Amino acid sequence: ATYAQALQSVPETQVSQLDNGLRVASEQSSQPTCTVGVWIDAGSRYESEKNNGAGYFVEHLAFKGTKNRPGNALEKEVESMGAHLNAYSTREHTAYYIKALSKDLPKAVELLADIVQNCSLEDSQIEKERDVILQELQENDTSMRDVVFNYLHATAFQGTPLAQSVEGPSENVRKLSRADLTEYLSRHYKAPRMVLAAAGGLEHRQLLDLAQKHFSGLSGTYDEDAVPTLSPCRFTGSQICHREDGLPLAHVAIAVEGPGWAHPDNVALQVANAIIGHYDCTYGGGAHLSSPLASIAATNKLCQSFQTFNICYADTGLLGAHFVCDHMSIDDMMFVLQGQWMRLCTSATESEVLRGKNLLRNALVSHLDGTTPVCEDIGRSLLTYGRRIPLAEWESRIAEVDARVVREVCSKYFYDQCPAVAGFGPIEQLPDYNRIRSGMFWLR
Amino acid sequence: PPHPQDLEFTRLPNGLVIASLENYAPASRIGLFIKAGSRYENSNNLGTSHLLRLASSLTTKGASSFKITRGIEAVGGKLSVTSTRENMAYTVECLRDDVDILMEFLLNVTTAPEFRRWEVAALQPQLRIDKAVALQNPQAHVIENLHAAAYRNALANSLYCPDYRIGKVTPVELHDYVQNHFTSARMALIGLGVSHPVLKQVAEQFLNIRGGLGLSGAKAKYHGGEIREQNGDSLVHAALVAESAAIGSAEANAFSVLQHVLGAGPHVKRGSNATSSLYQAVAKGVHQPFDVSAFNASYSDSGLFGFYTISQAASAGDVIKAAYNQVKTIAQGNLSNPDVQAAKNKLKAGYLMSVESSEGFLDEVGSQALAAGSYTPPSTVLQQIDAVADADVINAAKKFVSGRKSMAASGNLGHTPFIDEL
């Protein structure tokens, strides 16, 4: 009974659709508990300059009772039945999901529909959440990773929607009125632009009839030129350098233009990202670590943490790395890092690719462990790829990636490309952009 | 869906438990649970557990520190070490085709560690890091204190090394600790995504190390009392508990239900914890940002039960009292059947969920394989939850309000009460 065969015994996720558009999606196991949620293509990329910070505001209010369950009934009904209710907003996606017991599925599916459809948006509650979010933005302001990432977005996608933060400018939060929120909600929460995902102990067709029961009643089509279209966001080679010396450590994020949810390279890029890897001072590996960058960083204490990333969006992405370090190690960390990019680009060794391949292989499988993972996969898979994808397919895609491909693919996106650089903190050492740019070609 | 398999079970001649679920995942997860937590550290060799935890992948008999680190990462495996106050859990992950190499590497780390003075000495200052990394969470302090206030001998021990001991841990003390506590009568081998025969074959041949408990734990002599670390944070953390009942007794269950009646934690994101008794009882008379929840610790030897308060600067006096009165008027018996029946649901689901992903499951299978003798399928536990009467709950509440008191507080403690002011 091999890993090759293990991919076969994976339940092929079942997917149906309604006349009113809503896609229904499900993965069946004999799991006594299950996860079920609604996934929606909405957020701060669909938002605009005046209405920035609203998706967040809705995500806030959504759990403060509906019309059918006013006040904190919606809360109580879910709290008391044992099950869990959660939600999140990003720049491209919105998710509202519930972990429940299998038997609760019908009771669960109903509530979500209520949360999405018959939301209250209490006028006294808006003024209550306004004060929340305003303070929620003060928290972020001292969470350097978030700040540097938002900066990276800002200066990487400058002048576009993507550059916008999911939380939104503190101004907007204090001047958004019901009118905006309701309009956003009605214009964006459309049944063809939504998916109902579920995973665990449940049979597909049970969900479908519950979607026909409670979601058929949702706005099922759209008017002609009101449901909008997405403009490609221009990636700008640039730098944003928040020099704050008072802060203990420097945060820096650097990235070139990614490919987008679309692109097949996103396999070879993930395999590549796996080769350079990730590290922080509590790792056991230390010097003996496989990633040269990690081992160098570790032996020399160049940084206290670094991680590579491939943030993906519709037609673009952010492909690079982040590190947190001492006010004197930035240049070196940067240099070792870029060094790795170049060394990959020009001469990725064969085995070290196979090392990535397996790391990724492990990553995806041990990622899809539970229901909360798989439901979240299925919810998003349809919102991006348009399908859900088999692990046995991802496997095929990975098994084709070898040194030549990794090289071609990295060289494609790194070699002689203008990167986007966000630096926050005691960054007086952070290299000049003219210099960093020179770290993207041949060697000095 | 696939067809569910029997979680197999064997208990070899020398008391060594072996379990294996063959669930045919692409992922293989193998744990070796050992009774070697903080509780078995004596008044001298403190921190030796904490170091031993970090010490995995230091040169072993058959594999060098390099070989171990590069070998696992060559196939993209994972070697994790998971320490309770009671149980150490060496848990490996990988793809079901590499199982034997991850197995091998695991057995060297557990049965054949060399602990070379120059490695052991060079790892030392990691304790400093890993400690201060964990003591970011103001909880860790409060909880570390709480146990040292509550108990005396075994469970009084911190999971992280004391300051004075950082650096002082000797390679001989690791040899000693391992030799004394890594024994057949204290070990359970748990396998997920692996067949039973090979887990047997491996354990018979390569784990058969002298199985007589080299040291035994104490009987956790409960003391009770208060530790207060004045440190001027924006908030005040304060935990107040009492002598509870051990795991495996139906009296633990009562506290497990009593907990979810008072406070479980967030169920609904952004919610005002509407159903949470404690939060709601402290969601009165105090017009502040605050937090409170029901703390419930349960070991094989003993157990703690009470509440944890994350209050304001001056609100501490109010929150800790108001949360207490609320438990008192449960010990007095103000508890409708719906409140028990909700809590039973919260616990019943909460349990089933916590074994959902292979990661928890294995920890529970190991947990049972060490703390008790056998695996006890969810249904029986869910049944045992229903077996708990409404008496046992109010009797647990009574056992709290009457029982001996332990308190651990840190923050600005100017307006924080003491056990006698309560």
């Binding site: 928290e139 | 970090l54 994790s80 890993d130 909880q139 937090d291 994350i310």
Partner: peptide, 27 residues
């Protein structure tokens, strides 16, 4: 580190160091 969202917040302690996963103070 930032402060606000505390609603039955502290976990109910398990210490967990590792090789790969960053050290976690569960519960």
């Amino acid at each position: 580190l930032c402060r606000e969202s505390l609603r039955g917040q502290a976990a109910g302690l398990v210490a967990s160091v590792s090789l790969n996963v960053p050290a976690s103070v569960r519960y």
